[PDB]
Structures are given as C-alpha cells and as structure tokens.
A paper describes a structure:
The bulk of DNA synthesis in eukaryotes is carried out by three polymerases: Pols α, δ, and ε. Polε is believed to be the leading strand polymerase and, like Polδ, achieves fidelity via both accurate DNA polymerization and 3′→5′ proofreading exonuclease (Exo) activities. Pols α, δ, and ε belong to the B-family of DNA polymerases. As in the Pol2T:A structure, the Pol2G:C catalytic core surrounds the template-primer with the palm, fingers, thumb and exonuclease domains.
We present here a crystal structure of yeast [name] catalytic domain that differs from the Pol2T:A structure in containing a slightly different protein construct (residues 1–1187 versus 1–1228), a different template-primer, a different incoming nucleotide (dCTP versus dATP), a different nascent base pair (G:C versus T:A), and different metals (Ca2+ versus Mg2+). Also, the protein construct we used contains wild-type residues in the exonuclease domain, as opposed to mutations in the Pol2T:A structure (D290A/E292A) which renders it exonuclease deficient. To prevent degradation of the DNA by the [name] exonuclease activity, we prepared the protein-DNA complex in the presence of Ca2+ (rather than Mg2+). The refined model of Pol2G:C consists of residues 1–1187 (with missing segments 1–29, 215–219, 225–231, 665–677) of [name], nucleotides 1–15 of the template, nucleotides 2–12 of the primer, incoming dCTP, 4 Ca2+ ions, 1 Na+ ion, 147 solvent molecules, and 1 molecule of ethylene glycol. Most of the contacts to the nascent G:C base pair occur from atop (Asn828 and Ser829) or from the minor groove side (Tyr 645, Tyr831, and Gly832). Tyr431 lies in a loop (residues 430–439) of the exonuclease domain and approaches the incoming dCTP from the major groove side with its hydroxyl group located ∼4.0 Å from the dCTP N4 atom. The structure reveals Ca2+ ions at positions A and B in the polymerase active site. By contrast, we observe Ca2+ at site B, coordinated by residue Asp290.
Numbering used by the authors: 30 to 90, 110 to 214, 220 to 224, 232 to 664, 678 to 1185
The structure:
Amino acid sequence: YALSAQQLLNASKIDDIDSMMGFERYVPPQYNGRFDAKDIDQIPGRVGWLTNMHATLVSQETNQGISGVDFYFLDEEGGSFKSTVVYDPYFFIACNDESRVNDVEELVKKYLESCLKSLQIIRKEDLTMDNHLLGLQKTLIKLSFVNSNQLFEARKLLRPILQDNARNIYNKVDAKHLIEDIREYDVPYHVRVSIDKDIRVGKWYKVTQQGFIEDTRKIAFADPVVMAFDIETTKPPLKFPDSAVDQIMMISYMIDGEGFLITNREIISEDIEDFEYTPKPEYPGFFTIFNENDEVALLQRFFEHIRDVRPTVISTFNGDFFDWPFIHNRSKIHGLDMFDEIGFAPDAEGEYKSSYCSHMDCFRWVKRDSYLPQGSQGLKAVTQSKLGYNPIELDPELMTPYAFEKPQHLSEYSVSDAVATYYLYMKYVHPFIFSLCTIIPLNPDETLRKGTGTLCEMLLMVQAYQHNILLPNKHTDPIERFYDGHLLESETYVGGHVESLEAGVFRSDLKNEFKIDPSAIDELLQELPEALKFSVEVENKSSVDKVTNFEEIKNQITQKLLELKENNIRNELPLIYHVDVASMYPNIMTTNRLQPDSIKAERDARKLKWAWRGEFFPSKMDEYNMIKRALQNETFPNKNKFSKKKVLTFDELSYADQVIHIKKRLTEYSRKVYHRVKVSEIVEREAIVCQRENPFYVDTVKSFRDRRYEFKGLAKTWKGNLSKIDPSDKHARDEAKKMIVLYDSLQLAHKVILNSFYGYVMRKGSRWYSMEMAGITCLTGATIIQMARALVERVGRPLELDTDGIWCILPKSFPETYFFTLENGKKLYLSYPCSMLNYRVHQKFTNHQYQELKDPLNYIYETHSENTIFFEVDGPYKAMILPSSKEEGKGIKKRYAVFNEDGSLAELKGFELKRRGELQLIKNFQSDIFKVFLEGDTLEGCYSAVASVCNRWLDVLDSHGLMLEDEDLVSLICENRSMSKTLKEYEGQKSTSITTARRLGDFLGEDMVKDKGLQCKYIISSKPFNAPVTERAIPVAIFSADIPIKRSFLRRWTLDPSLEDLDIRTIIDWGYYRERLGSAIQKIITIPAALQGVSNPVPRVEHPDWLKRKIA
DNA sequence: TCCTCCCCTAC
DNA sequence: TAAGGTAGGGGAGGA
Ligand SMILES: Nc1ccn([C@H]2C[C@H](O)[C@@H](COP(=O)(O)OP(=O)(O)OP(=O)(O)O)O2)c(=O)n1
Ligand SMILES: [Ca+2]
Ligand SMILES: [Ca+2]
Ligand SMILES: [Ca+2]
Ligand SMILES: [Ca+2]
Ligand code: NA
C-alpha cells in the first residue's frame, strides 16, 4: 500500500532514461484479426531483435500500478524500441480435501479481499501424487493479483494460517484447516512472464497487437553497440586505492572496434597523442585521445560519450567490484549524478546495472564458464589463453609515478586492458551468453551471473511448466539428522573413483615390460566379432552389410591378439593412451532414466544401488540428551540487534542455532571421552527408479547434452581438419587452430552447466532434491571405470584413473586404429582399445527396462534398451610423467604431465605450477623441469638430464640466494595465498596468511585488511628462532617501504631489537625453502626414479629411510 | 602418527 | 538472498 507510488515514480524515471538512450515505448497498430504466423509479413507491427527485458510497474494508461515487463528491441533499420507486456502475477494454494475445494475458494476470496484480483480453479500434474501416470491431476486455486506488491501481501496474510495448521475432547471442519500449502509463490516475476509467454532474449520477434511473433526466418543476431571500458586510478604506495581520496587518472575503452582514451591532465603530464595498438591483425585498435583538464572533465566527457553512442552492451573486467563503484563515488564528490547521467546504478547486490544496457562483466564468464583454473583467471592469462597474444604488463606501484614520469607508456598499457576486455567479450562472452539466453528465461545480466545450478533450475521450470507439472517448492535442509542414536555431523554419498597405480616416466621410445594375461586375450577374441559389429552399427551408425573389409580387419586384429597370447611376456615401446567417458554422469542419468521424481519410497521399477557415507559423533542419545540440559542452563546474545533485549535463553535461539552449540559442545565431550570427534561409516543402499515416470527432468538433461555434443563434434572436425591439409606450412591456419580454441571453449562452457544437472539434485533450495539419485549416478560410474581398469590391467598397464578416465600404456603390438570401408567408399573409424571397452560397457550397463509413452491418450508404454555411455580415446602421446608420494606405498593422485609428439605440453594437471598462489620457486622449478623429461635416450639418461636442472636450482638455494639479483630473488621466494574471507572471521586460527595479514594491517593500516579475498604475499624468516612457522611470515611489502619504516617492524617481527641489517637475504629461512624444494624433487624425480630401478639421480636430495631400507 | 582446517585443483 | 556435486594434495597445527 502506497509504495506503488514509489515504483511508479521510479519506473517513470527509467522511462526517461530509456527515451534519452533511444528506447521509446512502442505500441503496435490496432488489429482485430486472426493472423497466422505463416503470414507474419501481412501483419501490422514492428520487427525487432530482443536484446533485454526488465520488470516494471505500469500506469493505467483501484489506482495502483500494473505489473509487466519492458522488452528492449533493436530493429532491422538500425534503430531501437521497447515494447511492454503486462501480465497478472499468480501462485497456487493446494488442499488436502478435493471435495471441499469451493469451500476454501470462498474463504480466501474474502479473507484476501484487500489484495486479491482474481481466483480460479486449475489442474496440474503433481509427481508427488499417486497414479498421476493414469491421468490424475491435483486441483489448485490460482490466485492472481494486479501487482507483485499485492501478491506479497497475500503471502503475508497466509503466513499466519499456514504455520498454525501445522475443543470438546469428547468430539464439519473450518475452511482454514484445509489450506495445506501454497505453491509457485517464489517465481521471480520476469521469469514468470518469459516462461508463460514463451519469450526469450536473443530471438527475433514481430511486435503485434496479438503479441510477440517469433520470426524463425532471421538467422544471426543483430549487431548491438558494444562498449568496453577499464579505468586506472591513483594508488598510494603499497595500498589499495580509495575512491574517497584518489583520482581516475584515465579511462580507456572501445566502441564497435574503435579505441578511445580519456586522460585527466591534472595527473597526466602531457596531452597524449592518437596511436595504434594492434596485438594482432584480428584485433585492430586505433585510439583517439581526449586529454582533459581535471577529474570531472573526463567524467563528463565519458557520460556525454555514453549518451552519444547509445550502447546496449557495456562490458568490463571485474567492473562490478572495482571500476563502477569507483566512478560512482568520484561522481558524487564532484556532485554529479551517475544515474541521471547515464542511467546506471547498483542493485540489491551491489552490482551495477542499467535498464537499456547490459553490464557484461567478463570476469563473471571467466570465473564460471571458462573452465580456467583460478591461477589463470587474471586478464593477462585469460588474454594469453583465449586471445593468443601477450598483453602489456605494468607493475601496479609504478602506474601513478609513470603518470607524471612516463605518461605515454602508462597510457599504452591502459589501452591494453581495454583491447583485451573488448575482444574477449566479443569473441567469447557475447555469443555464448546471448545464445544461452535464447533457451534460458533470463536477461543477459542474469544469464551471465547466476549460478549454474540456477541456470539448470530455470531450464527445468520451463520444461515442467510446458508439461503442466506443478513445481515443487524449494527444498530446505533439515535441522539435525541421526544415525543409530548418533547425531550426524555430516552425510553424503561416495563420489567418483580415483586410483594412482604407477609413478614415473613413460615415453614412446623407452621400452616397458608387459605381463599380458592370455586369458584376457582369449575373451577379446571370443568377443571380437560381436564387438566389431558393435563398432559399426552403434558407434558409427551403419550396418555390417555395407562394409567392404569387415573380414580383413577382423583377422588383422586377430593375428596381433594371438601373437600377444603366446608371446604374453614382452618388452617394447608403449602406446601411451587415454580413454575418457563422454559426459559420463549425464549419460548415466539419461541411460538409467535417473531423475529425482522417479525415486519411489516403496510406493509406487529398476533397483539401483548407491553408497551412503555418514560422519557421526561417537556419543549416544543420553550423552546427546545430557548435553542439552547442560546447555539449557546458559545465556547467549540476542542475534537481532533490532531489539533492546540483549540476553537470550537457550530455548529462545532458533532450532538452527541451538544445534550449533550442541554440536560444538558435543564435539569436545566426544573428544575427551571417546576420544574422536567423528566416526565415518559406509552403507550400501538400494533405491527404486520407476521407469515410466514423466521424463521431463531427464529429458532436459538429454536435450542439453545433445546441445554440447555438437560443439564437441565439429570442434573435433577442426581438430580433425587441422591434422590434415592445413598442417602444410606455410599457412595462415592458424585459422583451424582458432576454430578449435573457440569451439572447445563453447563445448567446455556447456560442460559445467550440463554436469550441474547432476549436482542440482543436491544443492541447497533445490526444487528437485534427491540424494539417492546422486549416489546412484556415482556408484554406477565407479562400477563402470573399475570394470574398464580391470580389463586394461590384463593387457597393459594402467597408470592413473579418475572417475571416468584411464591413463595407461599398451604394448605397440596391441591393435589400434583401423578403417572400415563402405560400398559408398566412405570410411568408418575404429580404435580397437576404445571400442573394446565400449562393447563391454554396453553388454553390462545397458538399461533394458527403459520405458516410454508411445500413446498418451491411451497411456501405452513401449519398452526398449537405452545406453549412451561411451569411452572415447585420445593419443597416443610422447610422454607421461607421474609423481610419487613421500609416504610409503601411497602415490599421488590427480597430478601428471603429458606431452605430444611434437614436443608440446598436452596436459599439466594438479601441480603447484597451475595453482593460484603457492610458492613461486616451486612454480618456476616445475615449469623448468617437466620438458626436460623429453631428453636422454635411455631411462636413467632421462633422469640424468632432469637431475642437472635440479642441481642448478638446489645451487641457488644452497647458495643462500647470492646468485640472484634482488628483484629476481624477491619474486622466487614469495608465497601468495588468498584469504577467502576477512581476517576477523578466522579468529582462533593460526596460519601464515593470517599472520601476514595481521602484520600487513599494522605496517600499512587496517584499511588494508577490511575486505575479503586478500592476497597475502609473504616470506619466511629464520628469526625469531624456534617460533612456529605460522609466526615467521613477513609481508614482502616491507622491503619496499622507506627505511625508517622497515626497521621498526623487521625489529618487531624478528624479535631481536639489535638488528640493523635489512637485506632480505639476511632474513630468509633458507632451510625452509631448501626443504620445500627438496620435497618436490623427491615426489617428481628421485622417488619415481627409484620405483623404476634407477638409483637416486639427485643424491643431494636424500631418500626417505623407508625407501633406503627397501634398498636391501 | 593421525586428524582437521583451508585453498584450489580433478574429476 | 542466492547458492551444482565429491575426491584429493599438501602445508601447518595439534590430538
Ligand atoms: N565440474 C564437474 C566435472 C566433473 N563432474 C563429474 C560429472 C562428470 O560427468 C564426471 C566426469 O568428469 P569429466 O571431467 O570426465 O566430465 P564429462 O565426462 O562430463 O566431460 P567430457 O565430455 O569432457 O568427457 O565428473 C562434475 O560433476 N562437475
Ligand atoms: Ca581493471
Ligand atoms: Ca569425461
Ligand atoms: Ca575424465
Ligand atoms: Ca586430503
Ligand atoms: Na607434487
């Protein structure tokens, strides 16, 4: 009430912004006809490309706003407009008693009186309901409203009634007790409109008086006006900038391929000149300069320029977190209004959004969709990886000084950030997101930023809606859970399977010893015919009938196999192969028809197992019960500072908070008495997957899988292509290489979303929660990969295994690739080691119970066999190096290096080199070391070459760093560690990051550690002696402080007052670093060297005793 | 020697 | 207030 006044004032303000920027609210010509989408052209109205959409309140051309959505269009004529749909918000009440429905209808029609606009009886399929497969629907009351405000009040009015639900004791029930639950009450409005109306951003539409008519003719988006900007500010030495005090010394940016720079000459010592920055032909960048007087000349110039070009997309890089908020503040102090200026402002999440223009923050794409590791999510590494060139770097601390000192080069660097950001946006973020919008009921701002789980839920809501299925409410996690009287600390299911089986060096040129099992060779022979058939019909989708050389090929293989049976002990060059199941979990789901609503609790079939794993306290109910009364006797603080009541009973805390104390009180009691905090126990469990249920969920997974397989296909064609034709150099292909990066990126950017269909069943607030399904997917996978390993174990050596992949060696004698010939001359490709696995998967893991609706009207189901699980193969490779543990008998999982034959790095997994932070010495040393495994011409020769490098590095550290320039040394010895939260939120915890952060607070001021995500860069020191490692962490920033400053703290931290030497060398605990460098040499070189019968190739690093002992 | 925390990778 | 999952390496503390 009365707050519609607000939004209509605001909605109105937006309407003026939209008009300023070129979106006049357009209304289609009146027409009362019966148009056929066939004849769209005949119909009066405007054709536009939908580029955006937002919820707004609208004035009646009582007196309260009407809710609707503004849809932002670009038209075929290079213009823009916005059209508005209105649509009453709604949600449902569901009831226990089907019979008394009109009863409740009358109650609420009056009880809600004040806010209700309409009311109605509708029917939706509820999968929670018995025999809905026979056609039975749940009956609901559709509650509609004039605006979302009114809808919220209705919820407020039913809150009471709902909780209450959940006289003459010697005893026609009241209409209140029948209201069991409301439904679809938390669907965001604009989503509600996009789904029901079936409108998507990114699609073409003719706006007519009937509604939006999709023009399926138009292929290709329209070309919005894209601007990308990056700002540079003044920093203090060693500190973060402050919008409070510091100035925007420049603002570089691009607009449809044309650079601009805006300098603030109150900082820039000279009028900068127009210049060309063009990292590559594909990326031309000529800039124009707007040297401006002070801060505000630049600001206003910026805004004027936005207004001028009217951009629908403004892109940045972490602009939400830094760039925008800066600008905003510098705008206020200069007394400008940014909202009035260009119509941008922060939303409820502190993120900066406009109405007419999307703010595409590329960092969001990198974080979520790039599949890059966090250590490579900076604009430089992103640029290197995704753009293929080396961006300009500049030490942050020099950016201010160079403003005066070397201005033009500072300006050169700034345009680089923009060129990167702009072409990263246009080449990756733009197509991906906007295409994503064509299937997801979100606008670009949201399609870029929502969790992938949320992207999945949206898709599933469409699918459920269009099938007339009623949405389950969001799941809420339970307060506490028990197992055998024990309070469960945590519980889950056993995930994927991971094995480290062999360490060492493996090269296509160094023979390896094989111990083949003739038995296994037998089986492959007996299977061969049916397997070869499988490859043709299934893997390639043909018939053996059209096959020319099915028989030649069968013996080529057979000969080699037989040879291996007799000659089963051999010694030859290895084929270094990798096999990996394509979209494993999604295909396990779609194969077994796994979906949350198919898991029935005995009522009311495919039995599949999973493995539950609980982590519980050793204590029991009595001890649990005992602990509570003790806790009932205490006081706690009132969380809600909106009350003057400061002290709270235990029973007054939420059940939620209660359980926290109980846990932390019971954890200690457990410790003293039992005397462990957790017990873990694994229980095999079984579940029933009904095979006839509405497959709307699993169908959605299938649709999105197929969407990714295509990208995965042609990205294999261009990999396919490259290898032959364009590998002849000279060439500007190069282009083939550029296709692959772009497709593998698209297929990869789908990968996390796809696999989130699996994770979604486990997410908080999931509408489709099922732990059973998630467990079943994982146990099936574990079973499949262990079957594969067991086979390879017998015809080669598996080196490492993770969830759905095996790295292995096979003997060169093992049959590999062949081609089937057709009557048509076309050739079908076969990789026997792959297809040999796949035939076996399908023999054992096929779903023979898969059912489907052939006849919906007659409810007739047909049964058939489903299986879409396939290993695919890559390689063979030139080399794979695998680390080994320091602890005996244990290995290292999820770490290795693989090299192509052309000598390039195929894959680096897991190592510190790739990780964010870590000790830089180790990163560099690892960078150095791996390629050296490609040398020597014997095994021990290989370790020889690799040791030499080890020794140069040991030297540097034994040498106490005397060999190293000061600027180089300070780089190598740094360790960078990200604090995930803020220092304060760690209280009672000891870490090198904490200490460093602490000290970085005093040296520079608590303004340094205010925010989250602080990068603590530190060294270890010898002094104070004896002090635990977490105590000797020193902020590298000190050695850049002016001397008097460095003294006090060095003195303060070293805990020795006398000291007056300030060389970083005097400080460093070299014994620390020699040792961390030694552990790496051990795991990566010497200990793997051992396991292959090679004496310690780096004797300056001594074996572990246990490994010495094993020597004898 | 083991567990536990945290960050960040691998699936 | 919005929010996919589990398995693992390894540094560092302490039971
Ligand atoms: N971000 C990820 C990566 C993987 N997985 C789970 C589900 C995957 O199916 C399984 C296998 O990992 P892959 O990396 O092998 O994933 P796919 O098999 O799904 O991908 P590809 O088609 O590249 O083989 O692990 C996951 O849940 N989330
Ligand atoms: Ca920036
Ligand atoms: Ca896979
Ligand atoms: Ca894999
Ligand atoms: Ca671990
Ligand atoms: Na390692």
